[PDB]
Design a protein around this ligand. Structure first.
Ligand SMILES: CCCCNCC(=O)Nc1ccc(S(N)(=O)=O)cc1
Ligand code: NA
Ligand SMILES: [Zn+2]
Length: 257
């Protein structure tokens, strides 16, 4: 029964998920002056040309665009990663206001939203096994700021009416996630966790430096979604972000000078 409200939100999660107070929790604030350039970091390899999207689902916490991950079709390699990570889903976190919504922050700055492209390490065979491993997942995080529309996001925005409430899904085939990327693949990286329960410490975070711009109308449509199921009292799906957690014994590395 965890959520983002006053009585079940991030401050409560530790009671059911004690790892909430663990040693490599996410998100974190990215202090740009303290992050260190690592010249040995390889360029990211984002190979999404064969991506096969299947479905979009309102799961009561966010909406997920799901992919066929039963073959190497859309994969993330390189950067800090060893091996091949398959794209399984992407989703967003966003705010009730344009000045909040991202999970990671940059010099304490909050963006309007944050995109998470979730990948799992193929050496572990399936996603469920991968989340039990310290190098099981790689999540590519991309900040959203409000300005010009993102044309590649509009197909997502268009379908949200059909998945307004928790448990609703819709076909969502032939979507190209490459349309959600910024120009640059410069990034920060650090070892972290899932940012929602079960908060498993299985994620290599790769956070892009360059935000994408989305329009006020696009993010407004995110905010019309519901946390609740159909026929239940309406609770707008907004502010579904976890705040920055203590960095503890971690260094954030930068791919760029
Ligand atoms: C088919 C889709 C199943 C996905 N299953 C993933 C899942 O159960 N939970 C989950 C929680 C948080 C993140 S985050 N916010 O760190 O990226 C990503 C995934
Ligand atoms: Na506008
Ligand atoms: Zn997320």
């Amino acid at each position: 029964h965890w959520g983002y409200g006053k009585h079940n939100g991030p401050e409560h999660w530790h009671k059911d998920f004690p790892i909430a107070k663990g040693e490599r929790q996410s998100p974190v604030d990215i202090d740009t002056h303290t992050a260190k350039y690592d010249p040995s970091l390889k360029p990211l390899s984002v190979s999404y040309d064969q991506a096969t999207s299947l479905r979009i689902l309102n799961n009561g916490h966010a909406f997920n665009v799901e992919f066929d991950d039963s073959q190497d079709k859309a994969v993330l390699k390189g950067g800090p990663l060893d091996g091949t990570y398959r794209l399984i889903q992407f989703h967003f976190h966003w705010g009730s206001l344009d000045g909040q919504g991202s999970e990671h922050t940059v010099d304490k700055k909050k963006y309007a939203a944050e995109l998470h492209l979730v990948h799992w390490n193929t050496k572990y065979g399936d996603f469920g096994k991968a989340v039990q491993q310290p190098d099981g997942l790689a999540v590519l995080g991309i900040f959203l700021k409000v300005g010009s529309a993102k044309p590649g996001l509009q197909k997502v925005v268009d379908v949200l009416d059909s998945i307004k409430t928790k448990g609703k899904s819709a076909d969502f085939t032939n979507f190209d996630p490459r349309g959600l990327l910024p120009e640059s693949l410069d990034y920060w990286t650090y070892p972290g966790s899932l940012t929602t329960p079960p908060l498993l410490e299985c994620v290599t975070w790769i956070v892009l430096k360059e935000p994408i711009s989305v329009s006020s109308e696009q993010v407004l449509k995110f905010r019309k979604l519901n946390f609740n199921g159909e026929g239940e009292p309406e609770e707008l799906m907004v502010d579904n972000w976890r705040p920055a957690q203590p960095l503890k014994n971690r260094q954030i590395k930068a791919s760029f000078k």
